[PDB]
Coordinates of C-alpha atoms (C1' of nucleotides) in Angstrom, one line a residue:
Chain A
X398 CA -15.1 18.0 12.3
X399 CA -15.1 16.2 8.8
X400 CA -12.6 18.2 6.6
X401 CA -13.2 17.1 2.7
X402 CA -9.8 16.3 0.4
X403 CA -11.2 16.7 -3.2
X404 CA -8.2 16.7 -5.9
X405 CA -9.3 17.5 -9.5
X406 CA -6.6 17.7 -12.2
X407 CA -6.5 20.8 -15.0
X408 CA -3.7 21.8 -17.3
X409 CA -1.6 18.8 -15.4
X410 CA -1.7 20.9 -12.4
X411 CA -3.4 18.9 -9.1
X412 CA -5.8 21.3 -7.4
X413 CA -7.6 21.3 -4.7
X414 CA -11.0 22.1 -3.4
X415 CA -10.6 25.0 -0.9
X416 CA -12.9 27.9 1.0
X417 CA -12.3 30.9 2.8
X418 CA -10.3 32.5 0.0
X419 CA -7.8 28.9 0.3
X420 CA -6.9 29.4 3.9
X421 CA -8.9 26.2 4.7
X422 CA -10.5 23.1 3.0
X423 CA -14.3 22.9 3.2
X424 CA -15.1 21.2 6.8
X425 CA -18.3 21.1 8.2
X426 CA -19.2 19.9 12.3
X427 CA -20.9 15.8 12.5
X428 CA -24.7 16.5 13.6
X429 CA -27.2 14.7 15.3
X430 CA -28.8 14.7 11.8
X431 CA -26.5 13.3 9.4
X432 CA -26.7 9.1 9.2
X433 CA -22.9 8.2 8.1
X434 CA -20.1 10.0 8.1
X435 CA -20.0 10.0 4.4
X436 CA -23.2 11.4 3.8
X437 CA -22.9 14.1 6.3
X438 CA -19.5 15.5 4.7
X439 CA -21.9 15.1 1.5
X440 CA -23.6 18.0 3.2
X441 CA -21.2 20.0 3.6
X442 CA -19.4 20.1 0.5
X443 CA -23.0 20.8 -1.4
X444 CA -23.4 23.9 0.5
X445 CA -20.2 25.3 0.4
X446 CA -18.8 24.4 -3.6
X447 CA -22.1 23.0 -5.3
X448 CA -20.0 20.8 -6.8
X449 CA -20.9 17.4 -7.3
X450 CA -18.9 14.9 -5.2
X451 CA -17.4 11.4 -6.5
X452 CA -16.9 7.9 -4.5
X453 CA -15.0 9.1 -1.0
X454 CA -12.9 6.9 1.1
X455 CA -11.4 7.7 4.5
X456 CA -7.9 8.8 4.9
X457 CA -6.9 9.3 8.6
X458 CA -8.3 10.6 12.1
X459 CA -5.9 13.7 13.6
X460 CA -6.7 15.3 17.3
X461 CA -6.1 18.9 17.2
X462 CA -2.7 20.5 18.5
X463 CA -4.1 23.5 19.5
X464 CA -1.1 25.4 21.7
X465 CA -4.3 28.3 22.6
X466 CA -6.6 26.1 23.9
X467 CA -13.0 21.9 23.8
X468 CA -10.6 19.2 21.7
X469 CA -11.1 18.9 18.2
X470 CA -11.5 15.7 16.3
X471 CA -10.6 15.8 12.7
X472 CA -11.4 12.8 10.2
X473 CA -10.7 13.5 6.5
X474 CA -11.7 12.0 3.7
X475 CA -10.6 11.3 -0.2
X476 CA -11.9 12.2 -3.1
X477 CA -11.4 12.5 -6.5
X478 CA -13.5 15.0 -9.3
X479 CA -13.0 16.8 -12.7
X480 CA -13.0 20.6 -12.0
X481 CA -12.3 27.4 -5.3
X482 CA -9.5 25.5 -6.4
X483 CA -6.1 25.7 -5.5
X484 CA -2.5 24.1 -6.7
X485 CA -1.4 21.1 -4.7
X486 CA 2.3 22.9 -4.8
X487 CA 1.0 26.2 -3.5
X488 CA 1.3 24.4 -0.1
X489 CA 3.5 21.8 -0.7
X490 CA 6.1 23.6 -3.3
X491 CA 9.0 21.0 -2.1
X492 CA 6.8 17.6 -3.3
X493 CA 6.7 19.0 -6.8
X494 CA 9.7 17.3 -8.6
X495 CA 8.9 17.0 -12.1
X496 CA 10.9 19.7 -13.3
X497 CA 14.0 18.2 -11.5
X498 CA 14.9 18.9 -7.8
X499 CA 13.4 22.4 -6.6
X500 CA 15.1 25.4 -4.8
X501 CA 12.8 25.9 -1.9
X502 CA 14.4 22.6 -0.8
X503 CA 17.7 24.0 -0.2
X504 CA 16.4 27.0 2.0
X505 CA 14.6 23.7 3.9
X506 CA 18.0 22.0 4.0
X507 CA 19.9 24.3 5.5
X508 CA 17.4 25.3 8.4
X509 CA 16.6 21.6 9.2
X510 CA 20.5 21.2 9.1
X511 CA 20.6 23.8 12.2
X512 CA 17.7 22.8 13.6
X513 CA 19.5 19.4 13.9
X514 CA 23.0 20.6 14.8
X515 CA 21.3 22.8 17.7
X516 CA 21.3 19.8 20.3
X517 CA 24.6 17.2 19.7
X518 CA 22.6 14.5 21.4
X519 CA 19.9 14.6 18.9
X520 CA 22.2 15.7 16.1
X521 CA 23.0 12.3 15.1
X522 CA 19.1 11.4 15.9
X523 CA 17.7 14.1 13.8
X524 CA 20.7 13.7 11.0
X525 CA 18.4 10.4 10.4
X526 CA 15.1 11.6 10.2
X527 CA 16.2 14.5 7.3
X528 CA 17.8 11.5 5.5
X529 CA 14.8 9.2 5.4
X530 CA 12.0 12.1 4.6
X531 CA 14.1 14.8 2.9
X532 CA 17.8 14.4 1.9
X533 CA 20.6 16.1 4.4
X534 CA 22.4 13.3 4.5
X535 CA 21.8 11.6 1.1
X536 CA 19.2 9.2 0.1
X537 CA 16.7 9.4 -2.5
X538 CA 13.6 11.2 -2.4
X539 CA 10.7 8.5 -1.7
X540 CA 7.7 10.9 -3.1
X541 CA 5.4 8.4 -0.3
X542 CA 6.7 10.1 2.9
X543 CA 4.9 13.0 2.3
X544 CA 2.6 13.3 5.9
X545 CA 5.8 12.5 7.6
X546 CA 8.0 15.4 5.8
X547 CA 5.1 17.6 7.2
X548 CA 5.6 16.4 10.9
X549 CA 8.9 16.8 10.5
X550 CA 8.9 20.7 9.7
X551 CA 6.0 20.8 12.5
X552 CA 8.9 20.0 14.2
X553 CA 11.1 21.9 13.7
X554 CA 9.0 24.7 13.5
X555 CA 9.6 25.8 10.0
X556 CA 5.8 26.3 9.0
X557 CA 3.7 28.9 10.0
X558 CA 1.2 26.2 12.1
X559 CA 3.9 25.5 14.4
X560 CA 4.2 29.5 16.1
X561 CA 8.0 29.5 16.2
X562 CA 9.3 32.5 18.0
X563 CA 11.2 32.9 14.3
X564 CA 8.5 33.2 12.2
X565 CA 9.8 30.7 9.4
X566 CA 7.0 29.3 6.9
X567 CA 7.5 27.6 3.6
X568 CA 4.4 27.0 1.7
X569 CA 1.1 28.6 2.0
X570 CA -0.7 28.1 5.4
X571 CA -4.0 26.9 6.3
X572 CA -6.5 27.4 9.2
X573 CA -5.1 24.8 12.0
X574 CA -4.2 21.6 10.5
X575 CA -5.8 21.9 7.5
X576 CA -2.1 21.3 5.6
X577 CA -1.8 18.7 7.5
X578 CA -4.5 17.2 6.6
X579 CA -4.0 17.6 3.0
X580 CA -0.5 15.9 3.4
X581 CA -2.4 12.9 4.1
X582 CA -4.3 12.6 1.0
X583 CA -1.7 13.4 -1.1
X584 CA 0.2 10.2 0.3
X585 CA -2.4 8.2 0.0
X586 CA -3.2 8.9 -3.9
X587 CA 0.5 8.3 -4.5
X588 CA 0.4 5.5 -2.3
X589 CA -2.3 4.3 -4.8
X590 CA -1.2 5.2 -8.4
X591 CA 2.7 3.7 -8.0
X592 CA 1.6 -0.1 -7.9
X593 CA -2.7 0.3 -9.7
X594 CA -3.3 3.9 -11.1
X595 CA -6.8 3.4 -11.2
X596 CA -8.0 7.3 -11.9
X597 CA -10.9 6.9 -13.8
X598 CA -12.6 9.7 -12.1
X599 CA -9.7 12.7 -12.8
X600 CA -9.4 11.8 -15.9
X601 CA -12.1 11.8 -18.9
X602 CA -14.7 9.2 -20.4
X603 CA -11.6 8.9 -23.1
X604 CA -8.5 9.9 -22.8
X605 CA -4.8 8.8 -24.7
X606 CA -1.7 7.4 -23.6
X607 CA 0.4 10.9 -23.2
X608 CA -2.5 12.3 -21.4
X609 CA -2.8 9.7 -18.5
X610 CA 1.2 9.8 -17.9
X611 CA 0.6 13.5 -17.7
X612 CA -1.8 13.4 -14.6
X613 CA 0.1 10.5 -13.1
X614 CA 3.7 12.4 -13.2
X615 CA 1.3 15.3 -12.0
X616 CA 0.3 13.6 -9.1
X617 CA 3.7 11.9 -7.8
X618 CA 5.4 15.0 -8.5
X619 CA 7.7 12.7 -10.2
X620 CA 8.9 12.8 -14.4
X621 CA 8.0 8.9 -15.0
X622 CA 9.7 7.2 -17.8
X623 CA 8.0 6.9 -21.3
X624 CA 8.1 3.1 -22.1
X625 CA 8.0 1.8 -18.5
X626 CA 4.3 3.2 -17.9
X627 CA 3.0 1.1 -20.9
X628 CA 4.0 -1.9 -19.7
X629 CA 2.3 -1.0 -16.1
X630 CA -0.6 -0.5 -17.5
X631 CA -0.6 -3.7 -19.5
X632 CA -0.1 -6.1 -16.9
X633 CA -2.6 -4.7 -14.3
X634 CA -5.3 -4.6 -17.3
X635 CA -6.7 -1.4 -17.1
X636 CA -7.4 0.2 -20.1
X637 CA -8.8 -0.6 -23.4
X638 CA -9.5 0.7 -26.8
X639 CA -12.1 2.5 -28.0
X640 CA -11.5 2.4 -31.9
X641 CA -11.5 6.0 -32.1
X642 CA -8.5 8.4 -32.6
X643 CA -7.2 11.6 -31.6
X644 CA -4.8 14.2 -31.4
X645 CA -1.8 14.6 -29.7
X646 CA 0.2 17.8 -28.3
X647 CA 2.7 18.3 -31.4
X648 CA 0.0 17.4 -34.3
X649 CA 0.6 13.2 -34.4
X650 CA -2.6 10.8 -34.1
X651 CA -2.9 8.7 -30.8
X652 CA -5.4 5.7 -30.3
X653 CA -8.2 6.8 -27.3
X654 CA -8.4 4.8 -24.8
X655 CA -10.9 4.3 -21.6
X656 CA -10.7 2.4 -18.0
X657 CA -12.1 -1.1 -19.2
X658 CA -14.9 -2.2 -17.3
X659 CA -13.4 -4.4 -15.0
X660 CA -12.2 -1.5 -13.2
X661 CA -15.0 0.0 -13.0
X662 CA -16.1 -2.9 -11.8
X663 CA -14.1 -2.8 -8.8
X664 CA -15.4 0.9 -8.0
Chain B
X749 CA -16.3 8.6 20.6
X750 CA -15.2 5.3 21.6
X751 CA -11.4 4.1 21.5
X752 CA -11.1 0.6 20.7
X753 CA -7.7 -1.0 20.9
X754 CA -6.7 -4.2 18.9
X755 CA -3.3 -5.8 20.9
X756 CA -2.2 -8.8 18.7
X757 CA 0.0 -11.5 20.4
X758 CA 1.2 -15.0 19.0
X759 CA 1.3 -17.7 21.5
X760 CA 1.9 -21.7 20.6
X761 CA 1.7 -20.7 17.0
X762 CA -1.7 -18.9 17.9
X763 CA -2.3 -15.3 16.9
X764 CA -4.4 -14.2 20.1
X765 CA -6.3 -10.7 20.7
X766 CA -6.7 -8.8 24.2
X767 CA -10.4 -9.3 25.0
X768 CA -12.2 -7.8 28.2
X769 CA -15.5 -8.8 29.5
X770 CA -15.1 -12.6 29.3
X771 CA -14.0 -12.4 26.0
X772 CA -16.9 -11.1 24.5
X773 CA -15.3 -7.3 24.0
X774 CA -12.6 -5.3 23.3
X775 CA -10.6 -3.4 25.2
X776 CA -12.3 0.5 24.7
X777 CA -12.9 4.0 26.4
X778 CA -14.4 6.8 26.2
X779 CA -12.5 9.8 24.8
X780 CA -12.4 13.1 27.5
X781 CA -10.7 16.1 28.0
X782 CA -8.0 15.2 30.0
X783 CA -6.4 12.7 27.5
X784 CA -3.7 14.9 25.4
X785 CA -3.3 12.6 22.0
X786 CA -5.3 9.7 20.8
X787 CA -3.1 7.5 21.3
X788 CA -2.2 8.5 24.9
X789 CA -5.9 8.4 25.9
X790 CA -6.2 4.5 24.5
X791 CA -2.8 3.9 26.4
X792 CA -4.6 4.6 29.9
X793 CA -7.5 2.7 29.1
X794 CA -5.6 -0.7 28.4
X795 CA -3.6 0.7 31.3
X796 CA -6.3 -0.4 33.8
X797 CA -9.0 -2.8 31.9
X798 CA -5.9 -5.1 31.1
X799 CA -2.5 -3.6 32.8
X800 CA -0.5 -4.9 30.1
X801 CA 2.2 -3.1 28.6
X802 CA 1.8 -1.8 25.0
X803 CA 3.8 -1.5 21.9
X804 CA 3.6 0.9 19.5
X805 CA -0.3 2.2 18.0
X806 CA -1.2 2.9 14.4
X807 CA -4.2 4.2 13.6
X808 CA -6.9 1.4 12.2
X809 CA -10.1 2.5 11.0
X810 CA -13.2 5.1 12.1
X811 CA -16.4 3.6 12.1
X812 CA -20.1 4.6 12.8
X813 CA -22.9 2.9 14.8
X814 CA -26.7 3.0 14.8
X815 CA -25.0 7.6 18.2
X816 CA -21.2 6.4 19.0
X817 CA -18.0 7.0 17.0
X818 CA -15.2 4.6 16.8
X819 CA -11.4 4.6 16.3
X820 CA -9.4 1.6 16.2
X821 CA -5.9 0.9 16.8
X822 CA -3.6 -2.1 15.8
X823 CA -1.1 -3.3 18.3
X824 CA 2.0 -5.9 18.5
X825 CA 3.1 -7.1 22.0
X826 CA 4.8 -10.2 23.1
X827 CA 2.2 -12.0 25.9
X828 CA 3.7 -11.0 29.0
X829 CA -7.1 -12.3 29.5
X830 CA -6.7 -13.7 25.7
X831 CA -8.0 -15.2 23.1
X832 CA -7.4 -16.3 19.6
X833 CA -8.2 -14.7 16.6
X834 CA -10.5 -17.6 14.9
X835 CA -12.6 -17.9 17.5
X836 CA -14.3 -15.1 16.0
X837 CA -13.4 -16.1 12.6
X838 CA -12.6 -19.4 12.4
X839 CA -13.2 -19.2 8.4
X840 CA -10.0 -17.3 8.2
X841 CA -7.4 -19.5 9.7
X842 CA -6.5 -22.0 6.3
X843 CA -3.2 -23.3 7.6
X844 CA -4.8 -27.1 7.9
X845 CA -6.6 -26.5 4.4
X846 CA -9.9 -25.2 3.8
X847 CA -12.0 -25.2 6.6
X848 CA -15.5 -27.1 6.9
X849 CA -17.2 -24.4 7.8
X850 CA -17.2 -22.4 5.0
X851 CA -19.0 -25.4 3.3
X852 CA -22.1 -24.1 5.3
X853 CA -21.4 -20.2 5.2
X854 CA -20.7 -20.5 1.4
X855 CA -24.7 -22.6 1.2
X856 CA -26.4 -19.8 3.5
X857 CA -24.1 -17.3 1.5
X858 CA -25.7 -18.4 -1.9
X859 CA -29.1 -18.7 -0.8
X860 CA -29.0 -15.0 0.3
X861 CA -27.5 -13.9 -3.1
X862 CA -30.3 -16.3 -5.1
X863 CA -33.1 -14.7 -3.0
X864 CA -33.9 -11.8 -5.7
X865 CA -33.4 -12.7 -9.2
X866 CA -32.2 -8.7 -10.1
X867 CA -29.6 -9.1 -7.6
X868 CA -28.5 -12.6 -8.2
X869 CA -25.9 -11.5 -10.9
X870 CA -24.6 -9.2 -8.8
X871 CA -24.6 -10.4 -5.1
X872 CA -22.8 -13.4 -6.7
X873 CA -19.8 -11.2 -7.5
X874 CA -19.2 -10.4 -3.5
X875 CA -19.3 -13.6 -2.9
X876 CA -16.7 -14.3 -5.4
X877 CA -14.2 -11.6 -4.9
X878 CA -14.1 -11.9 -1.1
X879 CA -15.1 -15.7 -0.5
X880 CA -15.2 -18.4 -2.9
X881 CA -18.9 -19.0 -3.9
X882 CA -18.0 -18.6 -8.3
X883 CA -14.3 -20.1 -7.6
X884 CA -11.7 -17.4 -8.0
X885 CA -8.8 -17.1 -5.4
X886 CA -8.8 -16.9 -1.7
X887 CA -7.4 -13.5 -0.9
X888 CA -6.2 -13.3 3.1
X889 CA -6.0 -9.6 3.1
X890 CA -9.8 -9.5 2.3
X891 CA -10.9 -10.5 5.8
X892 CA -12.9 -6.7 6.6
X893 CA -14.8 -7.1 3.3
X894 CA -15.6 -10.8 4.0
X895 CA -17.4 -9.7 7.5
X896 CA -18.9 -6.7 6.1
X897 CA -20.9 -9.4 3.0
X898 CA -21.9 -11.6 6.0
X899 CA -23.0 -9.1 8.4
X900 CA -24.8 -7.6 5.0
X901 CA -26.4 -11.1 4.4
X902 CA -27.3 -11.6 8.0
X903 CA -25.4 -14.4 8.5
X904 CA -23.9 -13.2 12.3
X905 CA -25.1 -12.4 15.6
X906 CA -24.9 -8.9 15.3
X907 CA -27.5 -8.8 12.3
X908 CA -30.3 -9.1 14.2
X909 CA -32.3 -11.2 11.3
X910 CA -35.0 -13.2 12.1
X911 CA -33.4 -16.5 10.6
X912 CA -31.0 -16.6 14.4
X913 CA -27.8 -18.1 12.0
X914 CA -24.2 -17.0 13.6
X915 CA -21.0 -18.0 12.8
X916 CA -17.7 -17.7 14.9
X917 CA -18.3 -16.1 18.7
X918 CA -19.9 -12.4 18.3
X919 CA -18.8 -9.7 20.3
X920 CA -20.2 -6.3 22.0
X921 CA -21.3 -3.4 19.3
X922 CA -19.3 -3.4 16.0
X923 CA -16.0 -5.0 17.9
X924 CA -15.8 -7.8 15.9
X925 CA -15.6 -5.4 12.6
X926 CA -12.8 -3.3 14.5
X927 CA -11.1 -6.6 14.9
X928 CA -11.3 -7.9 10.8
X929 CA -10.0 -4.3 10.4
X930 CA -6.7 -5.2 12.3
X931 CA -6.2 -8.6 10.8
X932 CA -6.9 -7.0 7.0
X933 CA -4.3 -4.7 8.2
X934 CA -1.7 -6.3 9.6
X935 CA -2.0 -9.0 6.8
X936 CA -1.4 -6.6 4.2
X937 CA 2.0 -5.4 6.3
X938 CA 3.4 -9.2 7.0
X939 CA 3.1 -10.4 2.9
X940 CA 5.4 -7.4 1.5
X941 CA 7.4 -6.2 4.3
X942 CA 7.1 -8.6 7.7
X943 CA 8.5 -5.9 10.4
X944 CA 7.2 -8.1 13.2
X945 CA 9.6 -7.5 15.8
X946 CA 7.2 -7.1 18.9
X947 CA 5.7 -10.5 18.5
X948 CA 8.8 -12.3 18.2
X949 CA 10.7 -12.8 21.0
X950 CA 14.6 -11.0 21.4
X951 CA 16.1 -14.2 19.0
X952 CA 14.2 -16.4 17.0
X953 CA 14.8 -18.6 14.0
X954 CA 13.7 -19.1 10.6
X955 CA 11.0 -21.9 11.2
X956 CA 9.5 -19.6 13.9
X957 CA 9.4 -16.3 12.1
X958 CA 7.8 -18.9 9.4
X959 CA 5.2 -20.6 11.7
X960 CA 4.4 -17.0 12.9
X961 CA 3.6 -15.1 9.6
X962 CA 1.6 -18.2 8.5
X963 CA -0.3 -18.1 11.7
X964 CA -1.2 -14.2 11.3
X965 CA -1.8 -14.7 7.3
X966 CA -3.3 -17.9 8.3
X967 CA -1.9 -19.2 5.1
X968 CA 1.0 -22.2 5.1
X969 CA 4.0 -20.5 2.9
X970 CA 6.5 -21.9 0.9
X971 CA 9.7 -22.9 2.9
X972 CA 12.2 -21.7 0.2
X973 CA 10.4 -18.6 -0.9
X974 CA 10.4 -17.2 2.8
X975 CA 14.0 -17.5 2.9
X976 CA 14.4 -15.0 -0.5
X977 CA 11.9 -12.9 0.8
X978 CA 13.2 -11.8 4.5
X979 CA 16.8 -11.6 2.6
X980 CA 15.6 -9.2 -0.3
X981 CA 13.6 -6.7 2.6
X982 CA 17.0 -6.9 4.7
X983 CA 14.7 -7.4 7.7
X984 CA 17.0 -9.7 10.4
X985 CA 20.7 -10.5 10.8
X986 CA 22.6 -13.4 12.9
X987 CA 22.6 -13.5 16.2
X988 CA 26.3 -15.5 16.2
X989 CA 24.2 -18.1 18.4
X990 CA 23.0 -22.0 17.5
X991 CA 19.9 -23.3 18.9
X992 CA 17.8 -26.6 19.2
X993 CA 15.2 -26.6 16.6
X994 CA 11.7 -28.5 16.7
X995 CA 13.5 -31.8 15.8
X996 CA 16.7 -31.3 18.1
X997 CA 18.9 -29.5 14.9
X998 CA 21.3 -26.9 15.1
X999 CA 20.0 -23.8 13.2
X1000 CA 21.3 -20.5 13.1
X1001 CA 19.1 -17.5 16.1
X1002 CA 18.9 -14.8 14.3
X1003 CA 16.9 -11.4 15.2
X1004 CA 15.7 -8.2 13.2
X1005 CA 18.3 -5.6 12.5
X1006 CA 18.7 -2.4 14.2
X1007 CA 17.5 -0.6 11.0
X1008 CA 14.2 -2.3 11.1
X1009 CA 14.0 -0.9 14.3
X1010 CA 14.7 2.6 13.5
X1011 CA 11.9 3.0 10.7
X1012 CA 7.9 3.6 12.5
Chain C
dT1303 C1' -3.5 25.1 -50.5
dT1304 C1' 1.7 23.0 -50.6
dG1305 C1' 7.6 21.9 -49.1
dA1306 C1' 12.3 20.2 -45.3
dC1307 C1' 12.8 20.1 -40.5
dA1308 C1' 9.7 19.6 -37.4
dT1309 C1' 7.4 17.2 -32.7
dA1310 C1' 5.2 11.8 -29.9
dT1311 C1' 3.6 6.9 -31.1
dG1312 C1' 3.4 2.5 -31.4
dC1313 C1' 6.2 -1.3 -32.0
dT1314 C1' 10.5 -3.1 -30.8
dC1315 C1' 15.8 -4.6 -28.5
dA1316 C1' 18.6 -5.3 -24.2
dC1317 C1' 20.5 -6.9 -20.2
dA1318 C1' 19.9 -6.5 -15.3
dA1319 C1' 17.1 -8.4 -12.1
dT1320 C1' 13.4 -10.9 -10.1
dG1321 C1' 10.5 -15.4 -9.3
dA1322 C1' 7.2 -19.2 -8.6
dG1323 C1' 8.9 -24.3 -8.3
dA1324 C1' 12.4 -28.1 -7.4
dA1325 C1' 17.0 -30.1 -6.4
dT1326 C1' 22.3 -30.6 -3.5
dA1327 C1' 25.3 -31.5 0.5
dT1328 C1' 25.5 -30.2 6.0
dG1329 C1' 24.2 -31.7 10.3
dT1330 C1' 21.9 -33.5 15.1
dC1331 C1' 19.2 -37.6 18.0
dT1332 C1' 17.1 -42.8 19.0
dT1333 C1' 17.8 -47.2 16.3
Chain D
dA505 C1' 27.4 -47.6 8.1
dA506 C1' 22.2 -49.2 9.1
dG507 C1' 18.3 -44.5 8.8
dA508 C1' 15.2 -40.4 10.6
dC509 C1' 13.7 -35.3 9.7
dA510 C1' 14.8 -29.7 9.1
dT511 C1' 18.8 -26.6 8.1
dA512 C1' 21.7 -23.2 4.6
dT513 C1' 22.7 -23.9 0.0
dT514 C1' 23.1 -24.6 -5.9
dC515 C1' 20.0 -24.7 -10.6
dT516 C1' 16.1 -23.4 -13.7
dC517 C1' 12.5 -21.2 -16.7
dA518 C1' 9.7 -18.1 -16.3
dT519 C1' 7.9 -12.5 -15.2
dT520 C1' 8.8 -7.2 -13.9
dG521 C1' 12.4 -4.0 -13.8
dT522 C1' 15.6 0.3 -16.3
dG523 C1' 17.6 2.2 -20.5
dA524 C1' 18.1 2.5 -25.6
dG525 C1' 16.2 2.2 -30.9
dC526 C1' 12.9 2.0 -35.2
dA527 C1' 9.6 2.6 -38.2
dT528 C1' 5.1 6.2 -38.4
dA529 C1' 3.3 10.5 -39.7
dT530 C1' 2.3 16.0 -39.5
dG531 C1' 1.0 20.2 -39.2
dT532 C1' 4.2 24.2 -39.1
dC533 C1' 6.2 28.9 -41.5
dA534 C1' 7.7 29.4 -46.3
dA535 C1' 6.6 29.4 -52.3

DNA sequence: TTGACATATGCTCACAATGAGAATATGTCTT
DNA sequence: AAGACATATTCTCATTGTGAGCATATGTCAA
C-alpha cells in the first residue's frame, strides 16, 4: 500500500489530506502498471482529491499489526500543498502546544502513570520511557519524538488502534495504522523546519515576516520567540525582498518577502 | 520485496560491510508470511547467509528496480565474509587527502555534463554540489547523491552504457545504492551525535574512538575539536583504567555511558 | 473625513554560551 | 639531563544562542 501524507496550512491551522469522511488518508494498492513508487501514489491521490500534488519524499516503511489476521506493507510519503482536509490536532490534540501545555495531557499522564505502576519490574523501566517522550517524570517536551509518543500509547493501549479490553482512546482514530503513519510525517517536517525551514510550498509566492513564524509555530506546535526566528532565517539565507509592502494583522506595514532562489534551487 | 541488510564493522581502522556471494552482494531475502516484523524476517536471513550476530536495525531506504521492491537496513556490530567500504567507493575514503581517482571521474564527469549545450549549465551544478567539478566543498554526508549523478551519467557497471567505464567494484542489482544509503546515513549520525557503541569495543580510548569516526566519515578530524565535541553530547565516561597507547603512553580507557545506552 | 490609546516592525542592546584555530605542562620508551 | 612522540589541559577571537528595549506608524471608535 502507498498511504499519501499531504499537509497544507490555512488559518495557521496544519491540515491534512484525508478520505472516507477522515477515517483514513488517501492510500491506493502498487500495480503492475505504475513505474515508480512516486508516480504511482501520483495516481492515487488524482483520483481520490483532484488535487494537484507538490515534490514528495519518502518518510518510512511500517508492516501491518494486524491482531485479526495476507501481510500488509505500508510506505508513506511527504508532501507539502496550499489547500477533505482535516486538523493535524484532531488526532494528535497532545502535540499542539502553542497555547501553553494542554489538558488532554494530564488525562494521558495519569493512565500512562498506572499503566507503568501495574508491573514493579517494569515500573522503573517504563517510568523512563514517559520521561523521555512525554513528561511523568519531568523533562522537557522535545516536540521531535512525536512517532515514538505514538508507539508508546500503542503500548499501553490507550488509543483505539490498540483494542484494549478498556476501550481508552485519545484523539480521533484512523483505519489501521493510518495515525501512525501520520505520526511519522509530522516528525519529519519538524525534524526539517527546527535547523532549515525551507516551506516554500505551504506558504505563498510572497509572504511577510509574521506570517512565516505563524506556520512555523503552527507546525512545531511550539510558540517560537519573536527576535530569535529573524536571525534563523538570516544566517541560512533563505529569504529575500521583494520591494513591495503589505499589511499586517493589527493595521502596521510589513516588507514582503519570498524564498530566494537559491532555495529553490535546491528543490 | 527484497530485504537487504547493511552490517557495518570497523577492523584495523577499516569500516568493512557484510558481503555474500564473493563479495559481489549483500546480504538479502525475500519477505514471506511467516516472518512477523521487518526487522525479524531480515534477522533470519543474516541468520543463515552469514550466522553472525546482529545489533540493532533501523530502517534505511525503499527503493525500486526495473519488478522487485527493496528495504534496507543499517547495522553496527563489532567483527566477531567482509569487506571494506571503498572497495566500492574508493572516491569516498579522503583520510590520506584527495584521492587520484576522482581526477578521472571528475574528466568523464564533465564530459557527460558538456555533451548537450542546454544542459551544460545545469548538469554542472550536480557535479558541484555533490563532487567537486565548479570547486565548492566536499560534503561526506552526500555519498547516495554522488552514486545516484554517476549511475545517471553512466559512469558504473550497473549503467549498462555502451562506453563499458566503471569505477570501484559493482555489485548484484541496486546493492551498491542500498549501500551509499547506509554510509549517507550513518555519516550524518557520527558528525552531530557519534553513538557508536557497537563498533567500539567494551573500553576504548580517545585516539581510537578518533581513528574510528574518521574512518566511517572518511574525513581526518581535528584532534582538539573531538575532545569538545564527545564532552558537550555527554556520550562516554572513564573507565578508572590506563592503557598503552599507539606509541607506548598512558592514556585514560574510557567507554560510552549507560545513558547512551538507554536512548534507541 | 479626523483625534488619544491603540496593535507589530524593524532596528537595536546584552550577556550567556559556543567555536574554529593554536598554545601549556604531564607523562612513558630506546638513546 | 641528552631527546622522541601523544595525552589531558589553559587561552583567544570569532559565531549562534536566550531575553530585554527603541524608535516606527495606524487604523480604530469618537467629534
Amino acid at each position: 500500500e502507498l498511504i499519501a501524507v499531504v499537509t497544507a496550512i490555512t488559518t495557521d491551522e496544519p491540515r491534512v489530506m484525508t478520505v472516507r469522511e477522515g477515517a483514513a488518508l488517501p492510500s491506493g494498492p502498487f500495480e503492475f502498471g505504475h513505474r515508480t513508487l512516486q508516480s504511482g501514489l501520483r495516481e492515487w491521490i488524482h483520483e481520490q482529491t483532484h488535487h494537484p500534488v507538490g515534490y514528495l519524499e519518502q518518510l518510512y516503511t511500517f508492516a501491518d499489526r494486524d491482531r485479526n489476521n495476507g501481510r500488509t506493507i505500508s510506505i508513506g510519503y511527504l508532501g507539502l500543498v496550499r489547500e477533505f482536509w482535516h486538523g493535524w490536532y484532531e488526532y494528535f490534540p497532545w502535540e499542539d502546544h502553542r497555547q501553553g501545555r494542554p489538558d488532554i495531557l494530564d488525562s494521558i499522564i495519569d493512565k500512562l502513570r498506572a499503566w507503568a505502576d501495574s508491573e514493579p519490574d517494569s515500573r522503573a523501566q517504563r517510568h523512563l520511557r514517559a520521561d523521555f517522550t512525554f513528561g511523568l517524570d519531568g523533562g522537557g517536551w522535545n516536540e521531535e519524538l512525536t512517532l515514538q509518543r505514538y508507539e508508546l500509547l500503542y503500548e499501553a493501549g490507550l488509543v483505539g488502534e490498540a483494542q484494549s479490553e478498556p476501550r481508552i482512546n485519545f484523539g480521533r482514530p484512523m483505519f489501521a495504522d493510518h495515525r501512525r503513519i501520520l505520526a511519522t510525517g509530522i516528525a519529519r517536517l519538524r525534524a526539517k523546519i527546527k535547523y532549515r525551514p525551507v516551506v516554500f510550498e505551504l506558504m505563498a509566492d510572497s509572504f511577510t515576516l509574521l506570517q512565516l513564524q505563524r506556520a512555523i509555530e503552527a507546525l512545531a506546535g511550539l510558540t517560537l520567540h519573536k527576535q530569535n526566528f529573524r536571525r534563523l532565517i538570516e544566517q541560512q539565507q533563505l529569504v529575500e525582498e521583494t520591494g513591495d509592502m503589505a499589511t499586517e494583522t493589527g493595521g502596521r506595514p510589513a516588507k514582503l518577502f519570498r524564498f530566494r532562489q537559491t532555495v529553490l534551487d535546491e528543490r
